[PDB]
PDB file of C-alpha atoms and ligand atoms in Angstrom:
ATOM      1  CA  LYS A   1      79.827  -5.028 -14.599  1.00 60.69           C
ATOM      2  CA  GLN A   2      77.098  -7.660 -13.911  1.00 63.92           C
ATOM      3  CA  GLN A   3      77.806  -8.006 -10.120  1.00 63.49           C
ATOM      4  CA  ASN A   4      77.023 -11.782 -10.176  1.00 62.90           C
ATOM      5  CA  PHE A   5      77.083 -13.441  -6.758  1.00 64.50           C
ATOM      6  CA  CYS A   6      77.260 -16.702  -4.792  1.00 64.23           C
ATOM      7  CA  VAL A   7      75.715 -17.522  -1.430  1.00 63.83           C
ATOM      8  CA  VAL A   8      77.759 -19.666   0.998  1.00 63.98           C
ATOM      9  CA  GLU A   9      76.424 -21.176   4.241  1.00 65.55           C
ATOM     10  CA  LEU A  10      78.574 -20.830   7.401  1.00 61.78           C
ATOM     11  CA  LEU A  11      78.976 -23.866   9.696  1.00 59.28           C
ATOM     12  CA  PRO A  12      78.601 -23.185  13.495  1.00 60.02           C
ATOM     13  CA  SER A  13      82.151 -24.681  13.920  1.00 61.62           C
ATOM     14  CA  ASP A  14      83.658 -21.757  11.847  1.00 58.32           C
ATOM     15  CA  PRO A  15      85.137 -18.884  14.046  1.00 58.99           C
ATOM     16  CA  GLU A  16      83.415 -16.366  11.668  1.00 60.43           C
ATOM     17  CA  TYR A  17      79.981 -17.818  12.636  1.00 60.14           C
ATOM     18  CA  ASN A  18      80.678 -17.311  16.418  1.00 58.07           C
ATOM     19  CA  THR A  19      81.904 -13.708  15.792  1.00 58.51           C
ATOM     20  CA  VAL A  20      78.660 -12.791  13.865  1.00 60.23           C
ATOM     21  CA  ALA A  21      76.299 -14.701  16.260  1.00 58.40           C
ATOM     22  CA  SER A  22      77.931 -13.145  19.421  1.00 56.83           C
ATOM     23  CA  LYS A  23      77.451  -9.600  18.051  1.00 58.89           C
ATOM     24  CA  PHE A  24      73.786 -10.392  17.079  1.00 59.72           C
ATOM     25  CA  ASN A  25      73.133 -12.037  20.504  1.00 57.80           C
ATOM     26  CA  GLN A  26      74.255  -8.917  22.482  1.00 60.44           C
ATOM     27  CA  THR A  27      70.673  -7.530  21.970  1.00 57.74           C
ATOM     28  CA  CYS A  28      68.786 -10.454  20.236  1.00 58.89           C
ATOM     29  CA  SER A  29      69.799 -13.496  22.466  1.00 57.54           C
ATOM     30  CA  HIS A  30      65.979 -14.198  22.910  1.00 58.06           C
ATOM     31  CA  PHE A  31      65.696 -15.099  19.102  1.00 55.44           C
ATOM     32  CA  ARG A  32      66.950 -18.359  17.539  1.00 56.42           C
ATOM     33  CA  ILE A  33      69.505 -18.236  14.663  1.00 56.86           C
ATOM     34  CA  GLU A  34      68.591 -20.748  11.891  1.00 59.07           C
ATOM     35  CA  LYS A  35      71.633 -19.941   9.644  1.00 61.81           C
ATOM     36  CA  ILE A  36      74.347 -17.373   8.801  1.00 61.31           C
ATOM     37  CA  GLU A  37      75.380 -17.009   5.096  1.00 62.19           C
ATOM     38  CA  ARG A  38      78.291 -15.152   3.500  1.00 63.38           C
ATOM     39  CA  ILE A  39      77.548 -13.078   0.364  1.00 64.97           C
ATOM     40  CA  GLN A  40      80.338 -13.278  -2.284  1.00 66.10           C
ATOM     41  CA  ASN A  41      79.882 -10.529  -4.923  1.00 66.53           C
ATOM     42  CA  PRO A  42      83.313  -9.743  -6.569  1.00 64.23           C
ATOM     43  CA  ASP A  43      82.275  -6.574  -8.477  1.00 62.65           C
ATOM     44  CA  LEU A  44      80.428  -5.121  -5.415  1.00 64.54           C
ATOM     45  CA  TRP A  45      83.405  -5.950  -3.152  1.00 64.74           C
ATOM     46  CA  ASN A  46      85.845  -4.223  -5.597  1.00 64.36           C
ATOM     47  CA  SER A  47      83.728  -1.003  -5.847  1.00 65.60           C
ATOM     48  CA  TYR A  48      83.384  -0.956  -1.994  1.00 65.68           C
ATOM     49  CA  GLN A  49      87.189  -1.401  -1.453  1.00 67.32           C
ATOM     50  CA  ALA A  50      87.906   1.420  -4.002  1.00 69.79           C
ATOM     51  CA  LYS A  51      85.635   3.849  -2.014  1.00 68.51           C
ATOM     52  CA  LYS A  52      87.384   2.719   1.246  1.00 68.63           C
ATOM     53  CA  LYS A  53      90.862   3.488  -0.274  1.00 65.94           C
ATOM     54  CA  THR A  54      89.709   7.085  -1.201  1.00 68.48           C
ATOM     55  CA  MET A  55      88.199   7.617   2.300  1.00 68.85           C
ATOM     56  CA  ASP A  56      91.346   6.250   4.101  1.00 70.38           C
ATOM     57  CA  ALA A  57      93.555   8.641   2.061  1.00 67.65           C
ATOM     58  CA  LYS A  58      91.682  11.795   3.325  1.00 67.66           C
ATOM     59  CA  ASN A  59      90.332  11.171   6.904  1.00 69.30           C
ATOM     60  CA  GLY A  60      93.628  10.719   8.866  1.00 71.24           C
ATOM     61  CA  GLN A  61      93.356   8.559  12.054  1.00 67.44           C
ATOM     62  CA  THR A  62      89.553   8.042  11.600  1.00 64.50           C
ATOM     63  CA  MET A  63      88.438   4.370  11.598  1.00 69.37           C
ATOM     64  CA  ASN A  64      86.199   4.823   8.525  1.00 68.23           C
ATOM     65  CA  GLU A  65      84.490   1.387   8.636  1.00 67.52           C
ATOM     66  CA  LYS A  66      81.851  -0.010  11.062  1.00 66.35           C
ATOM     67  CA  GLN A  67      79.915  -3.318  11.096  1.00 66.26           C
ATOM     68  CA  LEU A  68      76.178  -2.476  11.447  1.00 64.70           C
ATOM     69  CA  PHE A  69      72.772  -4.225  11.121  1.00 67.56           C
ATOM     70  CA  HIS A  70      70.045  -3.893   8.487  1.00 68.38           C
ATOM     71  CA  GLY A  71      66.734  -5.764   8.560  1.00 66.21           C
ATOM     72  CA  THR A  72      64.771  -6.298   5.326  1.00 68.66           C
ATOM     73  CA  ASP A  73      61.893  -8.427   3.957  1.00 65.99           C
ATOM     74  CA  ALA A  74      62.629 -11.842   2.262  1.00 66.11           C
ATOM     75  CA  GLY A  75      61.698 -10.397  -1.181  1.00 65.57           C
ATOM     76  CA  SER A  76      64.557  -7.791  -1.084  1.00 63.84           C
ATOM     77  CA  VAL A  77      67.326 -10.421  -0.297  1.00 61.46           C
ATOM     78  CA  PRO A  78      68.061 -11.134  -4.091  1.00 65.32           C
ATOM     79  CA  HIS A  79      68.153  -7.333  -4.876  1.00 65.14           C
ATOM     80  CA  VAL A  80      70.626  -6.593  -1.954  1.00 65.44           C
ATOM     81  CA  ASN A  81      72.925  -9.612  -2.803  1.00 63.49           C
ATOM     82  CA  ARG A  82      73.325  -8.228  -6.370  1.00 63.30           C
ATOM     83  CA  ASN A  83      73.230  -4.415  -5.995  1.00 65.02           C
ATOM     84  CA  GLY A  84      73.742  -3.692  -2.311  1.00 63.85           C
ATOM     85  CA  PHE A  85      71.864  -0.699  -0.868  1.00 62.66           C
ATOM     86  CA  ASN A  86      71.576   1.499  -4.013  1.00 59.41           C
ATOM     87  CA  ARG A  87      68.969   4.102  -5.228  1.00 59.99           C
ATOM     88  CA  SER A  88      66.581   1.365  -6.532  1.00 63.25           C
ATOM     89  CA  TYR A  89      66.510  -0.283  -2.994  1.00 64.49           C
ATOM     90  CA  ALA A  90      62.878  -0.458  -1.609  1.00 61.42           C
ATOM     91  CA  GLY A  91      64.113   0.130   1.966  1.00 61.39           C
ATOM     92  CA  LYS A  92      65.386   3.666   1.131  1.00 59.74           C
ATOM     93  CA  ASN A  93      63.672   5.718   3.817  1.00 57.62           C
ATOM     94  CA  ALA A  94      62.938   9.455   3.868  1.00 56.46           C
ATOM     95  CA  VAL A  95      62.587   9.805   7.647  1.00 57.25           C
ATOM     96  CA  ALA A  96      63.978  11.985  10.572  1.00 59.81           C
ATOM     97  CA  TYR A  97      67.697  12.037   9.526  1.00 62.54           C
ATOM     98  CA  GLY A  98      67.480  12.102   5.679  1.00 63.29           C
ATOM     99  CA  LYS A  99      66.565  10.119   2.530  1.00 61.59           C
ATOM    100  CA  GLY A 100      68.944   7.115   2.309  1.00 62.76           C
ATOM    101  CA  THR A 101      69.617   3.659   3.743  1.00 62.74           C
ATOM    102  CA  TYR A 102      69.471   3.288   7.564  1.00 62.51           C
ATOM    103  CA  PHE A 103      71.883   1.026   9.545  1.00 61.41           C
ATOM    104  CA  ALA A 104      71.677   0.166  13.292  1.00 61.50           C
ATOM    105  CA  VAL A 105      74.489  -0.175  15.844  1.00 61.77           C
ATOM    106  CA  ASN A 106      72.305  -2.835  17.739  1.00 61.02           C
ATOM    107  CA  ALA A 107      70.537  -5.797  16.066  1.00 61.50           C
ATOM    108  CA  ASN A 108      67.303  -5.333  18.220  1.00 63.09           C
ATOM    109  CA  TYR A 109      66.478  -2.133  16.210  1.00 62.30           C
ATOM    110  CA  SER A 110      66.723  -4.073  12.871  1.00 66.01           C
ATOM    111  CA  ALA A 111      64.934  -7.150  14.433  1.00 63.07           C
ATOM    112  CA  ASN A 112      61.605  -5.174  14.558  1.00 62.07           C
ATOM    113  CA  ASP A 113      58.870  -6.845  12.341  1.00 60.29           C
ATOM    114  CA  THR A 114      58.443  -3.477  10.458  1.00 60.63           C
ATOM    115  CA  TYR A 115      62.067  -3.792   9.197  1.00 59.68           C
ATOM    116  CA  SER A 116      62.704  -7.590   9.240  1.00 62.60           C
ATOM    117  CA  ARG A 117      59.198  -8.691   8.109  1.00 63.02           C
ATOM    118  CA  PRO A 118      58.564 -12.428   8.899  1.00 66.24           C
ATOM    119  CA  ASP A 119      58.062 -14.506   5.707  1.00 66.92           C
ATOM    120  CA  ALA A 120      55.403 -17.288   5.039  1.00 67.27           C
ATOM    121  CA  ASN A 121      57.541 -19.787   7.109  1.00 67.71           C
ATOM    122  CA  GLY A 122      58.073 -17.223   9.957  1.00 70.50           C
ATOM    123  CA  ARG A 123      61.742 -16.542   9.072  1.00 67.35           C
ATOM    124  CA  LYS A 124      63.231 -13.013   9.615  1.00 66.93           C
ATOM    125  CA  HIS A 125      66.258 -11.549   7.754  1.00 63.32           C
ATOM    126  CA  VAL A 126      68.952  -9.147   9.091  1.00 64.84           C
ATOM    127  CA  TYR A 127      72.265  -8.351   7.287  1.00 68.58           C
ATOM    128  CA  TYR A 128      75.580  -7.715   9.174  1.00 70.85           C
ATOM    129  CA  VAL A 129      76.970  -4.940   6.881  1.00 73.09           C
ATOM    130  CA  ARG A 130      80.430  -3.322   6.376  1.00 71.49           C
ATOM    131  CA  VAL A 131      79.584   0.469   6.286  1.00 74.51           C
ATOM    132  CA  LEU A 132      81.923   3.405   5.437  1.00 74.57           C
ATOM    133  CA  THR A 133      80.669   5.829   8.132  1.00 73.78           C
ATOM    134  CA  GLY A 134      83.825   8.066   7.886  1.00 77.02           C
ATOM    135  CA  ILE A 135      83.347  11.548   9.452  1.00 79.28           C
ATOM    136  CA  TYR A 136      79.650  12.052  10.382  1.00 77.46           C
ATOM    137  CA  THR A 137      77.353  14.801  11.748  1.00 76.37           C
ATOM    138  CA  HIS A 138      73.737  15.118  13.042  1.00 78.23           C
ATOM    139  CA  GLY A 139      71.105  14.425  10.332  1.00 75.54           C
ATOM    140  CA  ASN A 140      67.849  16.205   9.341  1.00 74.11           C
ATOM    141  CA  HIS A 141      64.752  15.197   7.223  1.00 76.06           C
ATOM    142  CA  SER A 142      65.605  17.493   4.218  1.00 73.91           C
ATOM    143  CA  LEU A 143      68.890  15.610   3.353  1.00 75.74           C
ATOM    144  CA  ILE A 144      69.314  13.688   0.051  1.00 73.84           C
ATOM    145  CA  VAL A 145      73.163  13.946   0.361  1.00 74.80           C
ATOM    146  CA  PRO A 146      75.334  14.647   3.480  1.00 76.10           C
ATOM    147  CA  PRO A 147      75.838  18.344   4.501  1.00 72.97           C
ATOM    148  CA  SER A 148      78.992  20.323   3.630  1.00 74.96           C
ATOM    149  CA  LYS A 149      81.633  20.271   6.468  1.00 78.05           C
ATOM    150  CA  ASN A 150      82.747  23.917   5.808  1.00 79.08           C
ATOM    151  CA  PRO A 151      80.342  26.710   4.564  1.00 79.92           C
ATOM    152  CA  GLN A 152      83.312  28.267   2.633  1.00 78.09           C
ATOM    153  CA  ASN A 153      83.848  24.935   0.733  1.00 75.91           C
ATOM    154  CA  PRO A 154      80.342  23.535  -0.162  1.00 78.35           C
ATOM    155  CA  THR A 155      82.197  20.741  -2.121  1.00 82.47           C
ATOM    156  CA  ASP A 156      83.728  18.825   0.882  1.00 84.58           C
ATOM    157  CA  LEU A 157      80.901  16.935   2.641  1.00 86.87           C
ATOM    158  CA  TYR A 158      80.452  14.609   5.639  1.00 91.15           C
ATOM    159  CA  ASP A 159      80.604  10.845   4.763  1.00 93.55           C
ATOM    160  CA  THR A 160      77.335   9.833   6.587  1.00 94.43           C
ATOM    161  CA  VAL A 161      74.856  11.345   9.148  1.00 89.95           C
ATOM    162  CA  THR A 162      73.699   9.991  12.561  1.00 89.75           C
ATOM    163  CA  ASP A 163      70.926  10.462  15.215  1.00 88.85           C
ATOM    164  CA  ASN A 164      73.513  11.420  17.941  1.00 89.83           C
ATOM    165  CA  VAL A 165      77.197  12.302  17.106  1.00 87.46           C
ATOM    166  CA  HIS A 166      78.720  11.289  20.501  1.00 86.36           C
ATOM    167  CA  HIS A 167      76.420   8.273  21.310  1.00 85.53           C
ATOM    168  CA  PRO A 168      75.114   6.953  17.929  1.00 89.54           C
ATOM    169  CA  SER A 169      72.456   4.299  17.515  1.00 88.93           C
ATOM    170  CA  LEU A 170      71.799   4.831  13.715  1.00 88.54           C
ATOM    171  CA  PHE A 171      73.708   5.839  10.548  1.00 90.23           C
ATOM    172  CA  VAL A 172      72.350   6.993   7.112  1.00 91.12           C
ATOM    173  CA  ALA A 173      74.339   6.169   3.904  1.00 90.53           C
ATOM    174  CA  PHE A 174      73.491   8.156   0.714  1.00 87.04           C
ATOM    175  CA  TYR A 175      75.795   6.634  -1.929  1.00 90.60           C
ATOM    176  CA  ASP A 176      76.184   3.380  -3.843  1.00 90.31           C
ATOM    177  CA  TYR A 177      79.182   1.202  -2.781  1.00 89.73           C
ATOM    178  CA  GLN A 178      79.267   2.836   0.707  1.00 93.27           C
ATOM    179  CA  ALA A 179      78.048  -0.504   2.271  1.00 92.33           C
ATOM    180  CA  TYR A 180      78.817  -4.214   1.632  1.00 90.82           C
ATOM    181  CA  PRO A 181      76.218  -6.901   2.717  1.00 92.61           C
ATOM    182  CA  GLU A 182      78.852  -9.413   3.967  1.00 88.54           C
ATOM    183  CA  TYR A 183      76.649 -11.704   6.143  1.00 87.44           C
ATOM    184  CA  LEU A 184      72.950 -12.633   6.077  1.00 86.34           C
ATOM    185  CA  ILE A 185      71.348 -13.850   9.363  1.00 83.49           C
ATOM    186  CA  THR A 186      68.141 -15.931   9.130  1.00 80.31           C
ATOM    187  CA  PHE A 187      66.291 -16.279  12.468  1.00 79.08           C
ATOM    188  CA  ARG A 188      62.852 -16.656  14.146  1.00 76.70           C
ATOM    189  CA  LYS A 189      60.851 -15.682  17.273  1.00 77.97           C
TER     190      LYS A 189
HETATM  191  C1  EBB B   1      65.666   3.730  11.675  1.00 78.80           C
HETATM  192  C2  EBB B   1      65.816   2.426  10.935  1.00 78.80           C
HETATM  193  C3  EBB B   1      66.643   1.432  11.449  1.00 78.80           C
HETATM  194  C4  EBB B   1      66.811   0.221  10.804  1.00 78.80           C
HETATM  195  C5  EBB B   1      66.140  -0.021   9.609  1.00 78.80           C
HETATM  196  C6  EBB B   1      66.297  -1.299   8.899  1.00 78.80           C
HETATM  197  O1  EBB B   1      67.010  -2.217   9.294  1.00 78.80           O
HETATM  198  N1  EBB B   1      65.580  -1.411   7.730  1.00 78.80           N
HETATM  199  C7  EBB B   1      64.759  -0.353   7.274  1.00 78.80           C
HETATM  200  C8  EBB B   1      64.021  -0.581   5.986  1.00 78.80           C
HETATM  201  S1  EBB B   1      64.315  -2.280   5.456  1.00 78.80           S
HETATM  202  C9  EBB B   1      63.039  -2.484   4.273  1.00 78.80           C
HETATM  203  N2  EBB B   1      62.246  -1.432   4.079  1.00 78.80           N
HETATM  204  C10 EBB B   1      61.281  -1.617   3.170  1.00 78.80           C
HETATM  205  C11 EBB B   1      61.105  -2.792   2.480  1.00 78.80           C
HETATM  206  C12 EBB B   1      61.993  -3.798   2.776  1.00 78.80           C
HETATM  207  N3  EBB B   1      62.978  -3.673   3.675  1.00 78.80           N
HETATM  208  N4  EBB B   1      64.604   0.805   7.897  1.00 78.80           N
HETATM  209  C13 EBB B   1      65.301   0.970   9.074  1.00 78.80           C
HETATM  210  C14 EBB B   1      65.134   2.197   9.732  1.00 78.80           C
HETATM  211  C15 EBB B   1      64.230   3.257   9.150  1.00 78.80           C
END
């Protein structure tokens, strides 16, 4: 499957725009939003929804999905809109909590120039992503996949890892189709 996509601009009058902007402005109200775009990728959406169905059927009462932030440079925007946050993604970091893609609870973390690098025109880019966090544990630098939940069953693993299990600020996703880049926020200092 090709995973062809379309990019649709949201009007400030749309209730979806106010929902996205309000969440972004909880920690980044000092920045100015230029535009919010919706990413429409049917094959990526279908593979994401299939993984969500499998996760919902095994985790009981757990609310398996969260909406998190991810800053990236302008050059990565066409790669993310097509493939999401896969193995070939340039922003795959091997840092403190494992080798995978990092997502922030608060936009201010993603709004750092190291993550959302300003382009030639001074525009910064942060995605508002649907992430299947599921059941998570504390991460470590050696991880390339999540740890096993039970030492007796090394087959059943955690869904993601975090920096702090009871008060998280970050999540690390290790698999393809575990995150959908629904909205793209373009803003400046
Ligand atoms: C802890 C954390 C929290 C948020 C982000 C984030 O929002 N982004 C990235 C990498 S984004 C990228 N990396 C390289 C080239 C182009 N884009 N790391 C992050 C990290 C390491």
